[PDB]
Design a protein around this ligand. Structure first.
Ligand SMILES: *[C@@H]1O[C@H](CO[C@@H]2O[C@@H](C)[C@@H](O)[C@@H](O)[C@@H]2O)[C@@H](O[C@@H]2O[C@H](CO)[C@@H](O[C@@H]3O[C@H](CO)[C@@H](O)[C@H](O[C@H]4O[C@H](CO)[C@@H](O)[C@H](O)[C@@H]4O)[C@@H]3O)[C@H](O)[C@H]2NC(C)=O)[C@H](O)[C@H]1NC(C)=O
Ligand SMILES: *[C@@H]1O[C@H](CO[C@@H]2O[C@@H](C)[C@@H](O)[C@@H](O)[C@@H]2O)[C@@H](O[C@@H]2O[C@H](CO)[C@@H](O[C@@H]3O[C@H](CO)[C@@H](O)[C@H](O)[C@@H]3O)[C@H](O)[C@H]2NC(C)=O)[C@H](O)[C@H]1NC(C)=O
Ligand SMILES: *[C@@H]1O[C@H](CO)[C@@H](O[C@@H]2O[C@H](CO)[C@@H](O[C@@H]3O[C@H](CO)[C@@H](O)[C@H](O)[C@@H]3O)[C@H](O)[C@H]2NC(C)=O)[C@H](O)[C@H]1NC(C)=O
Ligand SMILES: *[C@@H]1O[C@H](CO)[C@@H](O[C@@H]2O[C@H](CO)[C@@H](O[C@@H]3O[C@H](CO)[C@@H](O)[C@H](O)[C@@H]3O)[C@H](O)[C@H]2NC(C)=O)[C@H](O)[C@H]1NC(C)=O
Ligand SMILES: *[C@@H]1O[C@H](CO)[C@@H](O[C@@H]2O[C@H](CO)[C@@H](O)[C@H](O)[C@H]2NC(C)=O)[C@H](O)[C@H]1NC(C)=O
Ligand SMILES: *[C@@H]1O[C@H](CO)[C@@H](O[C@@H]2O[C@H](CO)[C@@H](O)[C@H](O)[C@H]2NC(C)=O)[C@H](O)[C@H]1NC(C)=O
Ligand SMILES: *[C@@H]1O[C@H](CO)[C@@H](O)[C@H](O)[C@H]1NC(C)=O
Length: 306
């Protein structure tokens, strides 16, 4: 049997042109004569484009529709129809029928999904250390049709607030989602990914932001295993501090005021010389960064033992 052959859905680009494919499978066993072929919009009191074996083409508005393959004189099989300058009002279900003989007339329906491919951004909104959940990263898919779907993925999930204004071309929408979280030191420099999903992309398109949080120094001192003894070799402690932006000043002092002679400060580190006689000092690393100045404590002992 003679059967008509066409996609169930066709995208579909605003302001572009598409080809609607429509083709007649005709098992080489049996013969048929196809007289004409008619594209019609859905229930429009009649046809939108019609081609004929001998009489040729005829269009509703000639300037915007064109039969791609159908050629005069030839045996008609390929109803494929190209229409230019898609607008929103061009979306709809279109029928394509062939007028054969002696089979009759076989037709199929094509959904013409017209859509617009948005493109998208993400920035990081730099945040201070407010108590409140604030926008820390923004994502924005401008000019979507249908609107894009914006989801966030990351190791530290927050609270996404999404919204959308009409887009540029009629029928488009630009979605602006922002990723709201209660800011905190340990998220600075961490990764948050915006996923913009849309039925026009090759694949969900992934946009990734480098979070930024400014904060005062968080300070601690490493370098001490409790077994420091008299006459050991120069052991040196680091004043680890993680701040944003990077710390500007390091200052070494003791709980007693001035550093003991044996402990010579070297920038962000304290060199601990050999000791002649046992000492205690609790040490203070006062770290100044662009935002404030914090400090950390450490009691350290040197004995004889073994
Ligand atoms: C192009 O053609 C498709 C194909 O389906 C068919 O052609 C249509 C024009 C129409 O004549 C259909 O009846 C016909 O089978 C169209 O897409 C279909 O549209 C129908 C009706 O609008 C949709 O029906 C809905 O189906 C949903 C699940 O698939 C269901 O959840 C919906 O339920 C809700 O609405 C119904 C009333 O419709 C209501 O009773 C319920 O209580 C509930 O609210 C609804 O039944 C189908 O989804 C679509 N079918 C397919 C296969 O996708 C399409 O609309 C048309 N193109 C354009 C641009 O309009
Ligand atoms: C370095 O400092 C230690 C003591 O370290 C301790 O912790 C500090 C943060 C301070 O709070 C110190 O006061 C505290 O002791 C010096 O050795 C310590 O000396 C004191 C006596 O002056 C010892 O007191 C004893 O307390 C224990 C119970 O906790 C009793 O059993 C004893 O009878 C005695 O009363 C203290 O134990 C002792 N610490 C140790 C580990 O033995 C140390 O002298 C000083 N460095 C030097 C050599 O000058
Ligand atoms: C029925 O006819 C239509 C129109 O002639 C056919 O559609 C298009 O035909 C062209 C040329 O054969 C295909 O393109 C060729 O492919 C590359 C890309 O793949 C393209 O860049 C060049 O134009 C190249 O010559 C094109 O893929 C095809 N378009 C579609 C939507 O299929 C159609 O193939 C015919 N249908 C059947 C069932 O025979
Ligand atoms: C997010 O972006 C920030 C930058 O805007 C990244 O910070 C950078 O982190 C790297 C190490 O992860 C630092 O690089 C190291 O720099 C030293 C020199 O100081 C060099 O010797 C090493 O070879 C290495 O390159 C880099 O300094 C730092 N950038 C700045 C401007 O301070 C951060 O890593 C990113 N985080 C994520 C999760 O993507
Ligand atoms: C998502 O965020 C928007 C924008 O910040 C919120 O819209 C606010 O809604 C509150 C409560 O209804 C109003 O008092 C404000 O005036 C709105 N702010 C702005 C800037 O328009 C909205 O509350 C959030 N939506 C959801 C579902 O959580
Ligand atoms: C954080 O995100 C950055 C991008 O901002 C990721 O960097 C990409 O890393 C891969 C290899 O892992 C490279 O192939 C790409 O070229 C990088 N992108 C850019 C723009 O340079 C990074 O992998 C992420 N890291 C974490 C821990 O999330
Ligand atoms: C830490 O250093 C800064 C920079 O000079 C100083 O002004 C501040 O008062 C210091 N704070 C303490 C507790 O030492």
């Amino acid at each position: 049997d003679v059967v008509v052959q066409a996609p169930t859905q066709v995208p579909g680009f605003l302001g572009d042109s598409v080809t609607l494919p429509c083709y007649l499978q005709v098992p080489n066993m049996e013969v048929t004569h196809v007289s004409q072929l008619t594209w019609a919009r859905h229930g429009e009191s009649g046809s939108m484009a019609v081609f004929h074996q001998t009489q040729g083409p005829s269009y509703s508005e000639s300037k915007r529709l064109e039969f791609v393959a159908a050629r005069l004189g030839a045996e008609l099989r390929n109803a494929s129809l190209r229409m230019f300058g898609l607008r929103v009002e061009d979306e709809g279900n279109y029928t394509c029928l062939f007028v054969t003989f002696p089979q009759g007339s076989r037709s199929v329906d094509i959904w013409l999904r017209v859509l617009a491919k948005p493109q998208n951004t993400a920035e990081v909104q730099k945040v201070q250390l407010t108590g409140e959940p604030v926008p820390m990263a923004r994502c924005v898919s401008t000019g979507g049709r249908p609107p894009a779907q914006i989801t966030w993925h990351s190791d530290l999930g927050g609270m996404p607030n999404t919204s959308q204004v009409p887009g540029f071309l009629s029928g488009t929408v630009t979605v602006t989602s922002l990723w709201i979280l209660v800011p905190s030191s340990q998220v600075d420099g961490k990764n948050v990914t915006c996923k913009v999903e849309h039925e026009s992309f090759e694949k969900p398109q992934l946009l990734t932001v480098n979070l930024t949080v400014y904060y005062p120094p968080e300070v601690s001192i490493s370098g001490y295993d409790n077994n420091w003894y008299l006459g050991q070799n120069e052991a040196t402690l680091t004043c680890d501090a993680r701040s944003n932006p990077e710390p500007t000043g390091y200052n070494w002092s003791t709980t007693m005021g001035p550093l003991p002679p044996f402990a010579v400060a070297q920038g962000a580190q304290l060199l601990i010389r050999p000791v002649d006689k046992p000492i205690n000092t609790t040490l203070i690393c006062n770290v100044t960064n662009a935002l404030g100045a914090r400090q950390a404590e450490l009691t350290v002992q040197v004995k004889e033992g073994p």
